[PDB]
């Protein structure tokens, strides 16, 4: 199903994650995006950064051309990268993403992160970046606009901007049973802003920014117990948890069997006791943890 966003558009509650590290051929994105749409995914998450918008857009166009879906059936997200925060760079970055994907509009365009980089850190008033995003919604380049990796103070900055025209529809953030963001989630619900969870299955544990000593979420013994109780899988428990707390959840997989498994999240539900057990795993663990950004002036986990 879908959640109604605060601008009246609708976002499917399960999303497909398209990021894969540079060792995976670019052409894999094309193949797995078509498999995702075949399995039932209708929300597809990409970004300028992922260097795959050509392949992702071609997958969506291929599934439109063969009659599987209409354009208005797909919710496609792209993201403005942090070297493009200066307001004059926002609409060109979005137009470039549209040309790569060969689409007329995105369903969602996000500020990918608040940590501005030189167009080496940069200092940019993100209120002015937001005004440029608003202009892209008014032009019809993006049906909806949102933010990603913002903390509550950063979100309030936008919500409190003089002459704000559109609130963010969402804040896409790292969110899973080790780092469940309840307080931020509550703040988002109080403003009718959707929290969208990434690394909901514990991240890809990329060696460039994730500590290999960190616990592997899908080997968690409480998730394994719940998967055995429901005869499902640790991944499906982790996804289902987000749906039941009102969080829209992404899931990346480049494996045909796991892509088809992940749509089963709609097939079962967890009890209040199961959900309390998963809530008991919260331990302030974000898998992103690198000197590369941890001392950025707008690092969101500084709090
Ligand atoms: N806004 C941002 O800054 C940001 C940051 C990070 C991620 N994201 C978005 O969120 C998406 C997902 O987050 P993520 O990349 O961190 O990965 P994720 O969804 O947490 O997935 C982690 C690993 O789970 C595996 N997996 C998937 N389904 C499974 C299943 N049913 N059973 C066992 N393992 C399974 C996948 O491996 P296999 O491929 O081998 O199946 C994947 O590499 C990204 O692709 C991107 O679209 C956004
Ligand atoms: C973690 C991560 C994973 C990816 C790839 C993706 O979007 O799939 N991105 C771009 C990041 C960030 O830039 C990021 C850096 C620091 C912080 Cl605090 C939050 C996000």
Curated annotation (Swiss-Prot):
Tissues with expression: Expressed in many tissues including adrenal gland, brain, kidney, liver, lung, mammary gland, placenta, small intestine, colon, spleen, prostate and testis. High expression in prostate and mammary gland. In the prostate, higher levels in epithelial cells than in stromal cells. In the brain, expressed in medulla, spinal cord, frontotemporal lobes, thalamus, subthalamic nuclei and amygdala. Weaker expression in the hippocampus, substantia nigra and caudate.
Disulfide feature: none
Residues the record marks as site: Involved in ligand recognition and product release: 209, 288
UniProt xrefs under PROSITE patterns: ALDOKETO_REDUCTASE_1, ALDOKETO_REDUCTASE_2, ALDOKETO_REDUCTASE_3
Binding annotation for substrate: 112
Residues that coordinate or bind NADP(+): 18-19, 45, 148-149, 172, 198-204, 252-254, 258-262
Pathway: Steroid metabolism
Residues annotated as transmembrane: none
Outcome of swapping residue 208 to P: Decreases in the retinaldehyde reductase activity. 3-fold decrease in the kcat value, whereas the KM value does not vary
Coiled coil start-end: none
Lineage of the organism: Eukaryota, Metazoa, Chordata, Craniata, Vertebrata
Keyword Cytoplasm on entry: yes
Similarity remark: Belongs to the aldo/keto reductase family.
Outcome (variant: residue 208 to Q): Decrease in the retinaldehyde reductase activity. Exhibits changes in both KM and kcat values
Localization: Cytoplasm
Domain of life: Eukaryota
Listed name of the protein: Aldo-keto reductase family 1 member C3
One of the GO biological process terms: daunorubicin metabolic process
Naturally occurring in which organism (per UniProt): Homo sapiens (Human)
EC number: 1.1.1.-, 1.1.1.210, 1.1.1.53, 1.1.1.62
Recorded GO CC terms: cytoplasm; cytosol; extracellular exosome; nucleus
Catalytic activity annotation: a 3alpha-hydroxysteroid + NADP(+) = a 3-oxosteroid + NADPH + H(+); a 3alpha-hydroxysteroid + NAD(+) = a 3-oxosteroid + NADH + H(+); prostaglandin F2alpha + NADP(+) = prostaglandin D2 + NADPH + H(+); prostaglandin F2alpha + NADP(+) = prostaglandin H2 + NADPH + H(+)
Record has Translocase as a keyword: no
